[PDB]
Structure 1
Amino acid sequence: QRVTYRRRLAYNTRSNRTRIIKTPGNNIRYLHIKKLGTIPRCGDTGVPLQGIPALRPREFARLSHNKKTVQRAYGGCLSANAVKDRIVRAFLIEEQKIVKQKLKQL
């Protein structure tokens, strides 16, 4: 059967996304589904982080703290490799500065 849109927002667009379902009354119906969520992305590299559910921005508030962050430094903001790269670079830079200061003082 030909089905019409539930709303009156003519000229269906990106927002107008529907799904066809069969009701217990044996009727085919348009069900408007909101856009899928987006998983957070790493700040340094940009790959989506691991262990964070892919949900909507407004929805993220409902989650608990542990479900939005990872138990590590910069957890929920930087990937594990990015954290590793950040840590080793900082230490090598500090050592490069400590030897440079040692060379200048002698």
Structure 2
Amino acid sequence: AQRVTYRRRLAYNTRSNKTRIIKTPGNNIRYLHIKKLGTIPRCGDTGVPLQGIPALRPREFARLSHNQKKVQRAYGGCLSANAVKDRIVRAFLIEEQKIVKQKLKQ
């Protein structure tokens, strides 16, 4: 059956030599050279992948509109929803404790 060749002079199965088979409108079986798969941004506090954002190679993110690269919320696109919620509650409670410790210091 039809056998294929690399379309570039790179002759080795490296991570930059990824391929997949296409069947053409000439009934030809041949390679298509494809890129590495994208990656979803990860939360800065927990490392979880961030929801609402596609998996792209780094420079592909330069072509999206602003709102596709973020979530409409504080730290959107940088922190997960549950991480932000921990930060808000932690900030409030710590500030209140600083208030009582200041009040009881006098």
Scaled by the length of structure 1, what TM-score is found? 0.94
CA shift, 1:53, in A, is 1.3
1:6 CA displacement:
0.9
How many Å apart are 1:36 and its aligned residue? 1.0
* Residues 49-97 of structure 1: CA deviation (Å, up to 9, x unaligned): 1101111211111111111111111111001100000000001110111
Q: Which runs of 5+ in 2 are unaligned?
A: none
Report % sequence identity. Answer: 97
Q: CA deviation at 1:2?
A: 2.2
Residues 13-70 of structure 1, C-alpha deviations (whole Å, 9 max, x = no match): 1111110111111111010110111011000111001101111211111111111111
Q: Does 2:63 align with 1:62?
A: yes
Any runs of at least 4 consecutive aligned residues in structure 1 with deviations exceeding 6 A, and if so which?
none
Q: Give the TM-score normalised by structure 2.
A: 0.94
User: Which moves more between the two structures, 25-34 or 9-18?
Assistant: 9-18
| Unmatched runs of 5 consecutive residues or more in structure 1 | none
Contact 2:15–2:36 (8 Å) recurs in 1: no
Retained in 1: the 8 A contact 2:70–2:77? yes
